[PDB]
Write a protein that binds this ligand. Structure first.
Ligand SMILES: O=C([O-])CC(=O)C(=O)O
Ligand SMILES: [Mn+2]
Ligand SMILES: [Zn+2]
Length: 444
């Protein structure tokens, strides 16, 4: 079908007015648009992209860490097995570390070398390339001018804003509410994925070269999960590059487009995507969580799915849900009912566990909390642990407070005789927050 190759939802900005025009924000967060390409964004705002050039980055922090992926240079939109016999989903992508200064040297010599081949005149085997990915730009003292430039964006796309759920988590989540940088040569690939806990994402191409994007709507993700499983791949943990002919056969629509320097790509919640550099360029990216029923719903879904698959959730959705109820006036009835439902479930589970402990003669110790203290995860299984913390007698005395969930503590110590139970919130107080959480009136 032509319907299997749909057009790209696109918007063309000329000036600051187009960029701050409220219908732009509405268009991006509309569930019907899996992706929005905002063309000419940096030009419209007069953003100085030179602050993110490789020359500038070397001058700023030349010894900064870079994660290196070593890959094969594949043709166009395909992925072949090493021998060049057939197209397969598994990608080769070996990891190591380098510095900005050393990768910059490779990026430049790569370009010079291709200029020479181009002046040498006239199925693989395939060449090896290196991709510099996941560069951490969270430190405001090291990247002051870079981070300040991104505050020039319209509020809905900023790393920090009052309407961003990730701003309401209350603590740093590396690479989600902090910026990541990518340094590339032609063929550099980001393999197939959904964002952490299905949060929206923003990506800006610094240039000077182009990137090519491939996008599949959220509601087809189960089909791609099946494909991975049938090819001995973990959808969440493995590196895979979809065979477009497999997808077409399975009637999965694929959005395909070019991202030019200064173009901003908005990836909506749960949208599946993979990317390759066409030329030499850098990119920057981070996550955003719009206050919509759609975003909250997909975030909760992936949170629960990650438990089944034994994968850690970077976003602590229990911690976040209480913060929303404490600090955010919710005027959408669907969104309000979703949050209320979740809090009620947390509250009942917490009540059940607490009374089981008390009925069995186990002391609950009042421990309390520091404000802005991050959520806790189980030191063994990495599930989020809220309020009732399980700590060993020894870690307690030493004041190390190494957190365990109830299930892991039990599996170790049958009657919890090796543990103490710490409580961070009084029950009356959580009941109060829940009770005072009501639907606000908005006429919008
Ligand atoms: O390689 C990049 O530009 C980062 C990327 O694909 C993404 O935003 O998922
Ligand atoms: Mn992404
Ligand atoms: Zn555990």
């Amino acid at each position: 079908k032509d319907k299997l190759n749909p057009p790209t939802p696109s918007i063309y900005l000329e000036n600051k007015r187009d960029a701050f025009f409220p219908p732009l924000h509405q268009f991006c967060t509309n569930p019907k648009n899996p992706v929005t390409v905002i063309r000419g964004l940096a030009g419209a705002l007069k953003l100085d992209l030179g602050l993110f050039s490789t020359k500038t980055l070397v001058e700023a922090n030349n010894e900064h860490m870079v994660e290196v992926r070593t890959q094969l240079l594949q043709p166009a939109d395909e992925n072949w097995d090493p021998t060049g016999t057939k197209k397969i989903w598994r990608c080769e992508s070996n990891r190591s570390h380098t510095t900005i200064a050393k990768y910059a040297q490779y990026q430049a010599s790569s370009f010079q070398e291709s200029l020479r081949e181009e002046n040498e005149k006239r199925k693989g085997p395939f060449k090896t390339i290196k991709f510099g990915t996941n560069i951490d730009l969270s430190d405001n003292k090291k990247w002051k001018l870079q981070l300040h430039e991104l505050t020039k964006l319209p509020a809905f796309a900023r790393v920090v804003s009052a309407g961003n759920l990730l701003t309401h988590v209350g603590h740093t989540i590396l690479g989600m509410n902090t910026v990541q940088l990518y340094m590339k040569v032609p063929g550099s690939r980001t393999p197939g994925h959904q964002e952490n806990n299905n949060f929206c994402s923003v990506n800006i191409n610094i240039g000077p070269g182009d990137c090519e994007w491939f996008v599949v709507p959220e509601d087809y993700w189960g089909v791609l999960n099946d494909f991975c499983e049938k090819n001995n791949l973990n959808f969440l943990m493995s590196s895979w590059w979809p065979n477009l002919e497999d997808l077409y056969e399975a009637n999965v629509p694929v959005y395909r487009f070019i991202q030019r320097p200064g173009d901003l790509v908005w990836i909506n919640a749960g949208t599946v995507h993979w990317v390759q550099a066409v030329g030499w360029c850098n990119n920057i990216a981070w996550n955003v969580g719009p206050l919509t029923a759609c975003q909250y719903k997909l975030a909760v879904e992936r949170y629960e799915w990650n438990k089944l698959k034994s994968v850690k959730s970077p976003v602590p959705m229990v911690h976040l849900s209480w913060n929303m109820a404490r600090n955010i006036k919710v005027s959408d009835p669907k969104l309000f009912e979703m949050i209320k439902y979740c809090l009620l479930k947390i509250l009942k589970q917490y009540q059940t566990l607490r009374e089981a402990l008390v009925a069995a003669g186990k002391e609950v110790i009042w421990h309390g909390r520091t404000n802005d203290e991050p959520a806790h995860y189980c030191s063994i299984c990495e599930v989020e642990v809220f309020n009732l913390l399980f700590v060993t007698n020894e870690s307690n005395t030493q004041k190390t407070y190494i957190v365990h969930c109830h299930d892991c503590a039990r599996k170790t110590s049958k009657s919890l005789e090796n543990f103490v139970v710490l409580e961070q919130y009084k029950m009356e107080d959580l009941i109060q927050v829940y009770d005072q959480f009501t639907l606000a009136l908005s006429l919008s």
